[PDB]
Amino acid sequence: GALEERAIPIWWVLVGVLGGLLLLTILVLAMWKVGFFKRNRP
């Protein structure tokens, strides 16, 4: 009810967000490196 450890792991939430952000950033930067966000298609 309160004592219980929902843990409302604000930290894990913060971690998840930061992590999701890092993953998005890396995928984004990587995709940018490989040119995927890029077109220059024929």
UniProtKB/Swiss-Prot annotation:
Source organism superkingdom: Eukaryota
Transmembrane spans: 7-32
Coiled-coil intervals, chain numbering: none
Motif (GFFKR motif): 35-39
Protein's name according to its UniProt entry: Integrin alpha-IIb light chain, form 2
Source organism of this protein record: Homo sapiens
Residues of the full protein shown: 989 to 1029 of 1039
